[PDB]
Amino acid sequence: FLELERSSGKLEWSAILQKMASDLGFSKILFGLLPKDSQDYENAFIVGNYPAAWREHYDRAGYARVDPTVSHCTQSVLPIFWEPSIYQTRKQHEFFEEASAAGLVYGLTMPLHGARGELGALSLSVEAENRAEANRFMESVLPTLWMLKDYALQSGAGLAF
Amino acid sequence: GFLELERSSGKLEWSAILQKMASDLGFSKILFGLLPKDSQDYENAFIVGNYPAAWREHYDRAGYARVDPTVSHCTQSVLPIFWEPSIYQTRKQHEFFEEASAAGLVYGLTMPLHGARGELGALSLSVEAENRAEANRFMESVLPTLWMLKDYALQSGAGLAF
Numbered sequence: 001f002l003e004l005e006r007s008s009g010k011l012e013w014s015a016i017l018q019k020m021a022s023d024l025g026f027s028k029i030l031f032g033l034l035p036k037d038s039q040d041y042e043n044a045f046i047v048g049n050y051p052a053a054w055r056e057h058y059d060r061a062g063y064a065r066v067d068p069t070v071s072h073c074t075q076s077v078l079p080i081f082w083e084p085s086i087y088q089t090r091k092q093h094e095f096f097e098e099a100s101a102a103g104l105v106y107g108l109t110m111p112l113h114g115a116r117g118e119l120g121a122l123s124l125s126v127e128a129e130n131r132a133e134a135n136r137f138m139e140s141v142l143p144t145l146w147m148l149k150d151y152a153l154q155s156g157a158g159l160a161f
Numbered sequence: 162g163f164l165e166l167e168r169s170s171g172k173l174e175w176s177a178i179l180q181k182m183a184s185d186l187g188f189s190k191i192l193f194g195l196l197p198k199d200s201q202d203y204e205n206a207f208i209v210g211n212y213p214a215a216w217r218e219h220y221d222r223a224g225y226a227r228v229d230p231t232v233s234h235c236t237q238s239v240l241p242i243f244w245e246p247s248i249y250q251t252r253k254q255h256e257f258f259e260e261a262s263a264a265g266l267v268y269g270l271t272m273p274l275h276g277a278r279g280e281l282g283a284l285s286l287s288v289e290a291e292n293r294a295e296a297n298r299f300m301e302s303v304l305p306t307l308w309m310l311k312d313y314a315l316q317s318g319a320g321l322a323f
């Protein structure tokens with residue numbers, strides 16, 4: 001994990017994080033971080049390879065207020081798996097279907113809460129033949145991910161702003 | 162594998178569960194402490210564990226919160242800090258280490274806690290060992306489990322404290 005700490009710039013750091021995630025077996029990621037006093041977007045540091053059409057769709061639809069992982073991050077330090085049970089409201093149901101259309105189906109989000117009051121998330125999505133396979137995989141690497149998210153948080157917070 | 166923590170209904174039951182989890186991982190002494198957002202009110206911090214009472218009192222009276230290198234570390238980082246000679250840098254910190262050792266707190270680590278609602282704290286665990294090579298073997302073997310444990314302890318502890 002030391003390679004993240006030793007990155008000098010955002011481009012280098014992002015490429016290292018993306019490669020680490022890929023080597024682990026996740027094809028898509030989002031790392032997002034806000035400074036302490038900031039609420040919604042605006043000065044958010046966002047990296048990764050989420051589909052650009054999804055990012056724009058999400059913003060226009062005001063999905064920060066719909067996405068169940070966002071509310072979860074505001075109240076918890078524990079991972080939230082993208083299971084059907086988290087998409088409860090009608091808007092969350094459509095959110096799930098639209099995310100799926102954009103290729104985001106199986107995954108998890110690790111909330112990020114930095115020492116300086118940074119608020120964010122490391123989300124990782126996996127391609128799998130089915131949900132059971134995706135969950136077996138995520139469980140198999142969970143302790144590694146749990147360390148990764150804190151290393152990414154500490155190093156990213158130092159570069160983000 | 163940490164479900165007992167969240168399900169715990171009271172501070173005494175929760176404390177005992179956490180102490181047993183730490184013991185099972187090889188650590189006979191722990192401190193779990195949490196303060197609310199932007200607070201330095203240690204008098205009203207949520208503190209559990211089994212550090213020697215003589216050490217706690219000494220620490221408080223000497224104002225060691227301002228000397229202990231693990232406290233300043235927690236303020237700036239989410240990463241663990243191992244209790245190694247290299248962390249005791251100032252003259253006062255060398256004295257701190259000597260006294261901490263007189264109280265049996267030579268080997269261990271501190272995991273900083275930063276809660277979703279701004280809580281600040283630490284899960285500290287001390288291990289008994291003959292030397293640091295042995296202590297390191299003991300700690301390295303359970304580090305990934307501790308890393309998850311500290312966050313489960315934070316989430317559940319923050320609910321009970323605040």
Ligand SMILES: O=C(CCCOc1cccc(Br)c1)N[C@H]1CCSC1=O
Nearest residue numbers: 032033044069073099104120121123
């Ligand atoms: O990755 C996410 C967002 C996770 C949370 O992101 C956050 C949360 C708080 C602050 C910031 Br910046 C980003 N959602 C996923 C769920 C399935 S589809 C999708 O976009």
Ligand SMILES: O=C(CCCOc1cccc(Br)c1)N[C@H]1CCSC1=O
Nearest residue numbers: 194195206231235261266282283285
């Ligand atoms: O366990 C600790 C203290 C860890 C940090 O504790 C904290 C930090 C922030 C808020 C609160 Br409450 C407690 N120190 C150890 C180092 C060796 S001897 C000793 O007491």
